[PDB]
Structure formats: C-alpha cells, structure tokens
Design a protein around this nucleic acid. Structure first.
Lengths: 48, 82, 49, 64
RNA sequence: CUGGGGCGGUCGCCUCCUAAAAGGUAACGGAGGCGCCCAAAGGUUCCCUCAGAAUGGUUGGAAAUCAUUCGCAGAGUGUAAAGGCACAAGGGAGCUUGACUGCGAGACCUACAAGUCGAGCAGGGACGAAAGUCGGGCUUAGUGAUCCGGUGGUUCCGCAUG
RNA sequence: UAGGCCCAGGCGACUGUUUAGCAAAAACACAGGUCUCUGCGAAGCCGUAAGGCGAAGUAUAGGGGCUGACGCCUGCCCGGU
RNA sequence: AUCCUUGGGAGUCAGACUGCGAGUGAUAAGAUCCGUAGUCGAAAGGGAAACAGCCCAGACCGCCAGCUAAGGUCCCAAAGU
RNA sequence: GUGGGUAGGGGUGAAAUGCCAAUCGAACCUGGAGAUAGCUGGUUCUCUCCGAAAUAGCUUUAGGGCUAGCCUCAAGGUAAGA
RNA sequence: AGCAGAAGAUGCGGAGCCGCAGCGAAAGCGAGUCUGAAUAGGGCGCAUGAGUACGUGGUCGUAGACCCGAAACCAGGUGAU
RNA sequence: AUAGGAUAUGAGAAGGCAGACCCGGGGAACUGAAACAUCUAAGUACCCGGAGGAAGAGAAAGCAAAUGCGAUUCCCUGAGU
C-alpha cells in the first residue's frame, strides 16, 4: 500500500518533496511542515 | 557416457566492499579524510575524529594519527596535531 | 565505441539548447586601445582597418 | 571529404577553456524515489569528463 | 555461462566461509537472504535494563501473569549472516517532523559510468535550561543508464515584431 | 538358344511409375469408397488487368481433401480449435 | 637509480610447468580454478642419456687464455682405480 | 522421331527434393560488387636502443572489443622512487 | 574561388577561417561568470602571455583503406536441341 | 449525317549510337546500424521514355528584416554550423 506521494505547499502551491507513506496506515490527506525556498520559511505541506 | 545432473544452489556472491586501515600510525592527514572503514565500531574514535553514517572514522583537525588501546582489548583512534 | 556496453555518449544526458539568435559583441581587450598614442575616435571602422 | 562531427556526442558535451570538457551526471532524470537528495545535490552540478575516456573521443568531436 | 553441446540450473544486489593475520583474490564451491517495511520501527529530552533458572502460588497447566534472589548478556537490536552495542545503537514515556534548502574543504573505492563518508558555513527550525544533537532507521541489502511522453514551477529562449 | 521348383509367413489388390548419375521398394499411381464446394460472366485457376483453362463441359459435371481392388465393417466424445 | 605528471605511439586481455599455500576432485590425473615465487613463453650454454617449464647460468664479437657454479673424477667421456 | 509451348521467389513432377543443357532446398550470364567476414592463409632489405602481457571491470560476451594493467618516444617536475 | 599569366611560380583578391578571454542551457554578463536569497562556499577560468600558416613523419575519420576468399542477396537478360 | 471505305500529297517518323553528361517515369538488394524490422546503403546501380550539344531551371506570390537587395546557373566560403 506504500505509495510515494509529494507534499505540496500551501503558502505557494508548490510540490517540493517525495515522502513514503501508507494508504492504509495513513489514509488521510497527510500534512507535515517543511521548508519552501520560494516561501523562505517553515510551511504547511499537505499531501497531494 | 554422460548423464545430466545439477545443480549447484550456491553460486552467488556480493560485491566486495572494502575495510581496513586507510591511513597508518603516524600519518599527516587532512581534514575529513577517512581513517578506517568499519562495519559497526570495531575501533572507537577519540580526539578530533568523528563517526560517519557508516560509523567510519575520519579526522577533523589535521596532524598525526595514533591507534591506541582503551583497556583491555579495545582500540581507539585519536588524531594529534603538530 | 565501448565493445557493446552502451557507450559514454549515451549514458549521459542532453543539455539543450542553442539560440535562434546569439550575438557576440566581440572582442575589444582594453590594452588593445593603447594602439592609439595619443589618438581618439575609437570606432570599429577605425578598428577594422 | 571533411571529418563529420559526430553530432550526438556534441549535444551532450561543452568544450571548456582547454578543456577538460563538461557534462551533466548520469542517473539524473528518470526516477527519484529511491535516490536520496544527498546523492541528488551532487548530481545536479555539472561534471568534467574523466581522463580515461577523454582519450577515445578527442578523435570524435574535434570539429567542436 | 558450460569441464564439447543440448536438457537441467544461474545471470543483478547484501552478508559469511573458502582468502593464504592489510585490502582485494576464481570455479556449475560451501550457506543464507534482497526487489521491502516504519508516520513512526525517524529526531531529541529523560528514565530503565535482558534471556533463562529456582522458590511459591488462581481456574495455573512443561510453559501466559505475579512476587525474592541469581543471572557480563546465554535476551533483543524490523527483516539474514558478519561485526558492534548495556555509559547503550536495547526496552518506556513526552514533545515533535532534520525522513532539511543551498552547499561542501577534504577523503575512501575504482576502467569509466558510478557508489560512500563527511568537519565546517548560511537559511530557517525541532528537541533541550543550557551543553548541545539532528541532512532518516546500529551498519552492510530492498534497486536499475539514455531516449521518449506527462505533472508542478520557471525576474529563460521564441525564427520580421508582439 | 530356349522356365528350376514346392511349402509357410509380414506388406501391398493387380500391369505401371520414381529418386537421370547409390535407394524400383512395403514409396507413388490406380479403379473403388467417401466428405466438401460450385447454377454456369462458375468453383478453383494463371493473370496488374484484357484474355484463357475449367469447356464448344453443365451437379450422373467439374475443382479440392481423406482413404485405397474384394469381403465383413467403419464403435464412443461438439469440451477445445 | 628509479619515480610522478603530461602528450604521441602500439601489442596482450586463451598461457603452461615446478615448489609453497587452497578449493573441486577420490587430500586422482602433464586435471581445473586462485594466491605467491621462479623459469619458459620472448633464453642460447652446460647438467638431468635424449627433454619449452626442474639444477646452474644469462649469449655485442674473436682467443689453440686462465678460474669456478650445477653435475662429476674405471672405459664410453674431461677430471682421483 | 519430327514439329512446337510451359522459365527460376517460376516451370514441371503416376512426387524423390526429383529435373530444368554433365549444376538443383531455388538454373545459368552480366552488373550493384572491390557485397561483408569478429574467421583462416600471406604480409618482401640491414643494424642498434629499450621491451611487454595472456590479469581485472564490463560486454549478444567468451578464439572479438573498449578502458585500466605492463611496454616505448618526447617534454617538464626534481630526488620524489625503492 | 576568380582575373592575367608557358596548364608554372608570381602578382592581386579580404570573401572567409584560427587565435587574441571566459562563464553559464539561456537572456546575458565579463578577470570573471555560473549555481546561487547570499559583498557565504564551490565548479570552469584569470593572474602565470602563443598562436597561426605551410612542409615532413607517427597516427586516426570517410572512401574497396592492408592483400587474397566466402556461402548467400538483389536487378536485368538467355536457355525444355 | 457519321463510322468507315477508296485516292493523292507530304526530302513527316519508327532504327541506331559517345559504355558519357542532363530531365522524367519505375527502381532493388548486399553493406552498415557491430543482431534488425524504423534508417542508411540509396532515389545508388538497373530498366524504360526524352532529345540536345548541351539539357534542366529562370525574371519574383524571391530572399531578407536595413540607409535593404533585384531572373536563374556555377565555384569558394558559410560549415559539418
């Protein structure tokens, strides 16, 4: 179920990453926070 | 004559990944050069040596390289400058 | 060639491209302009000849 | 008849100022899940053609 | 590939042994495995230490649990061998997302293509009082060139000019 | 100069034909048996087509396939193709 | 007295045998496949009777010069019954 | 016997891969054609200076090749080299 | 190249080429330029300055490319005396 | 009325060959790509129709982006870009 899906930005709408996550174990629209260089700060990154 | 009987079940082998003392006891050594490749910590780091992601030994500030002993049977890499 | 191993110009990527127009404003080194002693009027027509 | 440029090498190579040609690395745009970014931050540079295989294609792209 | 070939079997990756006390070092030699898994089985703060054995007990049983000594490790360390680990890298909490952008002096290995380690700098963090650690899992497997199409972004080019 | 016979077997009905230049045979042919297609500007043919075979033929005739006189027969499965 | 870089220029990417250490093999093979060392290959001369790999030793060329190594010193055949 | 047709990825065959001018799993001639050959044979006068390897990574690859490996020529560096 | 020139040098022709400076894909910038938020780092280059034209030889690219040799392929003709 | 038939007139044209060069219609393969089928080889050879000493093309629906050039052809650059 392990699918590699990018984690796009919310401040700018910009993909920027790849993360491993599970379709069963994490079924939500998962969200971490990382560093967008075009937004220069810590940024809410939901799954897309 | 001949009958055809096999087979061997055991032919495979990995790529030989290297270890051993890359420098000697008494080497001038530049910053960040690998002293000793390891699977684990077969020898621990001491003065001015870090530890890699492969738990490897590499010298930060230059100078001589001395292999030592903890006590009783346990070695230790430290780097002493000029 | 590489024997049959896929050779080095194929294991390496393209880097496009070349311009439809690229202009090369070339060349004047600055110490070329000590060819005038004393001199003025530095034009390419006075530099072509 | 002249020496043809082997064009397909010359799309991949940049002749520097003597030179020591340039190239971009392999493994560089096909698949990016498995390759970690510490590998990728060293592949997104350019690179200089190694001395062994520079012997075999100085005959090739001498017309630049 | 081959002890002629065919049939059988193998083609690549990690570990051990053969390997001759650096490091490599062959055969259709001897063993295992690998095309993953963990949103935490990651990072950090702070705790704690095993397995088995005996003694006695609740249906209790050769053994689930519970108490007192033993117990340097005979336990675990995702998965399998070698090394390593209790000051923990082993178990348990809390707060979290560094499983980080731009790098990278310098090294290791080597035909090349590759691959590996990185001190240190800046950007912003996380945990921590600080000291400080953090560029994923104790390490070593779990992955594949180029071309070709697609998706997001592009103070790039655009075939007389827009 | 003009046949050696006579029993008993396997194959093939037979006379014939073939590997010119190794193999005449138990091979092939064969009449007979069938299954099938074709209504005639035809079925199949050779043709890029025109033309022609089939044929101054007409389903008791042509083309294709299978098997091979004669006698007794030709059992079962339409799942697959 | 070699090494490092740099460039021009090629050959070989099937090796054998002997000893020492190994595997396969039956602790078989002038067997196969590795390390190490030699020689051959690319090395003539003397030994080992003849002998590519053992033992000794390196052929610029002439001498009707001398001294030695491996091996020898009754005849073959040089040198001690 | 005469006279005469059926022409080569075709003819013809009471079928064997037979026959088609002494040639048949595709007739002979002329050309593309100096087809290609990782394969074999051959590589013509002399002397000197040095003098290899049969190992590896790969490889539709094992009796081919390409980088290394060892050789040679020249120039720098200098005493690194053992 | 061409124009005069015994098909010859030679003359004249600047049309063009190489070099004089690079850096990025590129807009472009320039003893620097890229990557870079970066007057951080690093890659290529500068300080350190030789090219160019002809001639000789080692080579190599394209042609039969070092000689001799396939079996087969293709086009177009002659041959059932 | 036509098809057609008869007649005379045509210094009409069928054939050839300079094995070449030039248009047009057809038009392969072998070789390479280290295999091969896209490609190349190659619109090459070969066949066929045209003629002329030459043929073909040609006076703009052309280049090209300025202060523009003015029919085609050929050569050299442009550029193995």
């Amino acid at each position: 179920m392990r699918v590699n899906i990018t984690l796009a930005c919310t401040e700018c709408g910009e993909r920027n990453y790849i993360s491993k996550k599970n379709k069963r174990n994490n079924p939500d629209r998962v969200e971490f926070k990382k560093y967008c260089p075009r937004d220069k700060k810590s940024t809410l990154h939901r799954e897309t | 004559s001949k009958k055809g009987v096999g087979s061997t079940k055991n032919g495979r082998d990995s790529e030989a990944k290297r270890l051993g003392a890359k420098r000697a006891d008494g080497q001038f050594v530049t910053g960040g050069s690998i002293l000793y490749r390891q699977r684990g910590t077969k020898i621990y780091p001491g003065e001015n040596v870090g530890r890699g992601g492969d738990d490897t030994l590499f010298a930060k500030i230059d100078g001589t390289v001395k292999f030592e002993r903890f006590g009783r049977d346990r070695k230790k890499v430290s780097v002493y400058p000029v | 060639f590489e024997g049959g191993q896929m050779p080095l110009f194929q294991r390496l990527p393209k880097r496009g491209f070349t311009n439809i127009n690229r202009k090369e404003y070339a060349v004047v080194n600055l110490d070329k302009l000590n060819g005038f002693a004393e001199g003025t009027e530095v034009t390419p027509e006075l530099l072509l000849e | 008849p002249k020496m043809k440029t082997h064009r397909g090498s010359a799309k991949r190579f940049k002749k520097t100022g003597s030179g020591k040609l340039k190239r971009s690395h392999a493994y560089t745009s096909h698949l990016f899940a498995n390759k970690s970014q510490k590998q990728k931050r060293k592949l997104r540079k350019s690179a200089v053609v190694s001395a062994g295989d520079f012997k075999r294609i100085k005959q090739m792209l001498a017309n630049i």
